[PDB]
Amino acid sequence: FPQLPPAPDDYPTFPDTSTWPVVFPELPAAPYGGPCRPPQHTSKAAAPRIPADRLPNHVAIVMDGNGRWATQRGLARTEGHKMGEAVVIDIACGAIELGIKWLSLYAFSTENWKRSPEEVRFLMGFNRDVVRRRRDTLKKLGVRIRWVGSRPRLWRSVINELAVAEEMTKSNDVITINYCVNYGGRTEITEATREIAREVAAGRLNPERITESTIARHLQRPDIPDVDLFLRTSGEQRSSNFMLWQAAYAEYIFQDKLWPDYDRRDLWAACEEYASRTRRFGSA
Amino acid sequence: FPQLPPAPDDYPTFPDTSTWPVVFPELPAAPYGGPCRPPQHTSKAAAPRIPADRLPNHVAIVMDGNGRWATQRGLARTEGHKMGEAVVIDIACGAIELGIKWLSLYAFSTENWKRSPEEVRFLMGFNRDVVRRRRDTLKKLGVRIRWVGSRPRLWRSVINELAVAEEMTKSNDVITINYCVNYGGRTEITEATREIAREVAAGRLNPERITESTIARHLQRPDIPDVDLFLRTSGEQRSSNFMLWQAAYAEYIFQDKLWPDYDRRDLWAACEEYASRTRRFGSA
């Protein structure tokens, strides 16, 4: 089984949401060694034994309910998103422990521009900072992260920090994260159709030998496999333009828990649900 | 509202499951009315009087569980699909009673070629028959029925029974069933893109002017509105590649009931659930 073994009782925990930004624990040194073990949850729960063959290769997660988490408390929408950064990194430490290879996170879509300039301006600058703050934590843990999304109208500063983050981690392989910012499904499929029309213009491609693979090879990030499990948080039941191509044959699981009330044990609950189930016909 | 007021006491009931193929009720005249009103259910039950503003103008359905039903009672899979035929027509009648105008249907799938050559060689002949038999019923109900699928492998004979039923109901417009046979969410994108490529290579379209609108236009039927309500039965929480592009922001409602037990009242259940939900499209 691929799960790391339950952290020693005395290993640092995460998150300590008394401070903010939550402080990521100084972890023990390695012998060494290479990738550090991720701190254990504050509850010290341990990953569930699941064969590598019953696991989702690729968990896509639609974070949901930060704005609404704040609002039931008399707070500004945007403060909930701040309790979200800790849950992100938590779930990340959970997937590593669990033995998960690909994790997609829907930070911001091509449709979140509809919201107020006050919230759009907060999210843009909070993704920028988050990235810079976490690049070295994520790096050390075995994570390979990079920006997945569309370029039109996206704060340049977000594209930069993540290409810094891509350069540091383009050789890590404990797990891969696709940090989706200004991501739209149709927009990404649109981006590739001209990746294609462009080659056809360079007569470097036959328009009658075009396959689903041909399209899949011209998406922004072409090594992103199909999405096995589609977590969507806070009771909402929709994909919302997330991994449209990739998540076609995805199995859906909708948790009713607001994202900031979320933690890695929740990720493990769902994944178990997925693995323990009898794979039906045609079902991978 | 826009639903049809209740059908009188002694109105024709559907279905009468005392035979196979089940027989369709001799429907009252209505001169000088236009189309013939949809028969009421066998329970003579009432349609929900939902607001027009909480109606799913476009409801797509992945009719699942047809062969499990049969398996349960020591039957071969063929006999399950047979009883699900009268389910469709009955489900088409309730959509009209409820005032829905766009109904999609996953009759067959590109995925469906990996089923036994026996079961598949049967699923091609049954659909052809159903169009040939039921298309006159639908003609009178105001149903505009057409084909939506890839051609390769698809029996010519199926396509042409829908090219005939389409040509007969082209000016009808109480509802519009898109009968999907050999449908592939990606397969339809792929094909919209083969078109784009050709035009681009013929010198009639410049790669840098391709937008989402352009893909939306090069689809097989580019008039299909986005999908509002995405139903699937059996207990399967998957889009499984249905209306992939259309259903980007659709509301997934899932149920356990297998298709051959499914009847209109259950379709009305679904739309009340979609009715209570808040759709936001990237809005706060």
- Sketch out chain A's domains with CATH numbers: 12-277 (3.40.1180.10)
Verify whether the Cβ–Cβ distance A207 to B200 is below 8 Å: yes
Instruction: State the Cα–Cα distance between residues B37 and B94, nearest whole angstrom.
Output: 11
Residues of B near A (Cβ–Cβ under 8 Å) read 111, 114-115, 185-187, 189-190, 193-194, 196-198, 200-201, 205, 207-208, 210-212, 215, 236-241, 244-245, 247-254, 277, 279, 281-284
Tally: H helices and E strands in chain A: 8, 8
Instruction: State the Cα–Cα distance between residues A79 and A76, nearest whole angstrom.
Output: 6
Query: Is the bond preceding A21 in cis, omega lying within 30 degrees of 0?
Result: yes
Catalytic residue among B16, B57, B112, B129: B112
Q: What was the elucidation method?
A: X-ray
Strands B229-232 and B58-62, bridge-based pairing: parallel
- CA nearest A126: which of A183, A58, A166, A80? A80
Residue of B252, B277, B279 to mutate when probing chain A, most A C-beta within 10 A: B252
Instruction: State the Cα–Cα distance between residues A193 and A205, nearest whole angstrom.
Output: 12
* Residue A164: other Cβ atoms inside 10 A: 12
In the sheet that A143-148 helps form, which strands lie side by side, from edge to edge?
A143-148, A175-180, A102-106, A58-62, A229-233, A251-255
Nearest C-alpha in A relative to B253: A237
Instruction: State the Cα–Cα distance between residues A65 and A234, nearest whole angstrom.
Output: 6
Instruction: State the Cα–Cα distance between residues A254 and A237, nearest whole angstrom.
Output: 6
For residue B249, which residues of chain A lie inside 8 Å, CB to CB? 238-241
B145: Cβ contacts below 8 Å, ≥ 6 apart: B131, B135, B138, B162, B165, B166, B169, B176, B177, B179
Are the beta carbons of B248 and B270 closer than 8 angstroms?
no
How far CA B46 is from CA of A1, A179, B60, B162, B235, in Å, comes to: 55, 48, 22, 32, 26
Are the beta carbons of A210 and A196 closer than 8 angstroms?
yes
Instruction: State the Cα–Cα distance between residues B9 and B69, nearest whole angstrom.
Output: 32
Residue of A79, A116, A199, A212 to mutate when probing chain B, most B C-beta within 10 A: A212
Nearest to B193 among A67, A193, A201 (CB): A193
Are the beta carbons of A136 and A169 closer than 8 angstroms?
no
For residue B193, which residues of chain A lie inside 8 Å, CB to CB? 193, 196, 210, 215
Tally: H helices and E strands in chain B: 8, 8
Instruction: State the Cα–Cα distance between residues B284 and B280, nearest whole angstrom.
Output: 7
A188: Cβ contacts below 8 Å, ≥ 6 apart: A149, A150, A219, A220, A244, A245
* Residue A123: other Cβ atoms inside 10 A: 20
* Residue A279: other Cβ atoms inside 10 A: 11
Secondary structure class of B73 (helix, strand, coil): coil
Secondary structure class of A13 (helix, strand, coil): strand
Verify whether the Cβ–Cβ distance B248 to A185 is below 8 Å: yes
Instruction: State the Cα–Cα distance between residues B12 and B37, nearest whole angstrom.
Output: 10
Secondary structure class of A61 (helix, strand, coil): strand
In the sheet that B102-106 helps form, which strands lie side by side, from edge to edge?
B143-147, B175-180, B102-106, B58-62, B229-232, B251-254
Nearest to A210 among B193, B210, B282 (CB): B193
Verify whether the Cβ–Cβ distance B284 to A116 is below 8 Å: yes
Instruction: State the Cα–Cα distance between residues A63 and A258, nearest whole angstrom.
Output: 8
B6: Cβ contacts below 8 Å, ≥ 6 apart: B40, B46, B47
Taken in order B216, B218, B221, B223, the sign of the CA dihedral is positive
* Residue A183: other Cβ atoms inside 10 A: 28
